[PDB]
């Protein structure tokens, strides 16, 4: 989430990244460089579940209108 955002100063390692509490903002390097700003997650995600539930809601709406 976001760009470099130099407000944090230099970058921090994974070990120092874990020290941050959930919901914080950190300045990290993505792939070969590419500075970015990241937020620690508070959950575990499953894109397939989200897509399936969206399709289910869509078809429920279609049937209800029909």
């Amino acid at each position: 989430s976001g760009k470099y955002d130099p407000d944090l100063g230099d970058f921090k390692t994974i070990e120092e990244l874990e020290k941050l509490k959930p919901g914080e903002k950190a300045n990290i390097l993505l792939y070969q460089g590419k500075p970015v700003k990241v937020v620690k997650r508070k959950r575990y995600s499953a894109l397939s579940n989200d897509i399936s539930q969206g399709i289910k809601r869509q078809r429920m709406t279609v049937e209800s209108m029909g």
């Binding site: 894109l47 397939s48 989200d50 897509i51 969206g54 399709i55 809601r57």
Partner: protein
């Protein structure tokens, strides 16, 4: 490009994008970039909802 669309997108989103393109008479094969854009749009909408 179509191979990337098949790999990175579910068949359901691809079907929805193809249906949308058909409604507009636009060939998905002739405009693979547009198909990818529509698939990404549908995916981000579902992810938001």
């Amino acid at each position: 490009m179509d191979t990337f669309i098949t790999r990175n997108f579910q068949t359901t989103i691809i079907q929805k994008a193809k249906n949308t393109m058909a409604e507009f008479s636009e060939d998905p094969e002739l405009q693979p970039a547009m198909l990818f854009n529509i698939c990404v749009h549908l995916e981000v909408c579902y992810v938001i909802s």
